[PDB]
Design a protein around this ligand. Structure first.
Ligand code: NA
Ligand code: NA
Length: 118
């Protein structure tokens, strides 16, 4: 669920997830990604687009932490959603080096909207 994703983002990045990532660039919370962090969201949106069995927003899944990584429970019916969320939270962590707070106020008109992002 979205509530779990937020927890994953908070632990992966140490940032408050709503302020920091719910509205970032052109893809987070929604065009061509403006940077690496925005690309994480682009990939995440596409990942969610392949989910058929569960509600990406509403359904909860099962996971753990092992040695710095998120491990999705393979037995859970919504494990594909977990994998999407694991990947975006990890991707955010891996791109904090170029994260820019100015991208939270990114004007949608500046986004070059593409036809096939996935
Ligand atoms: Na923060
Ligand atoms: Na754990």
């Amino acid at each position: 669920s979205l509530l779990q994703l937020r927890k994953m983002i908070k632990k992966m990045t140490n940032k408050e997830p709503i302020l920091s990532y719910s509205k970032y660039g052109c893809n987070c919370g929604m065009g061509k990604p403006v940077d690496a962090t925005d690309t994480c969201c682009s990939i995440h949106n596409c990942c969610y687009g392949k989910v058929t069995s569960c509600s990406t927003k509403w359904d909860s899944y099962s996971y753990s932490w092992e040695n710095g990584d998120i491990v999705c429970d393979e037995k859970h019916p919504c494990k594909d959603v977990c994998e999407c969320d694991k990947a975006v939270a990890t991707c955010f962590r891996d791109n904090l080096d170029t994260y820019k707070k100015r991208n939270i106020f990114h004007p949608t008109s500046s986004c070059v909207k593409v036809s096939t992002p996935c």
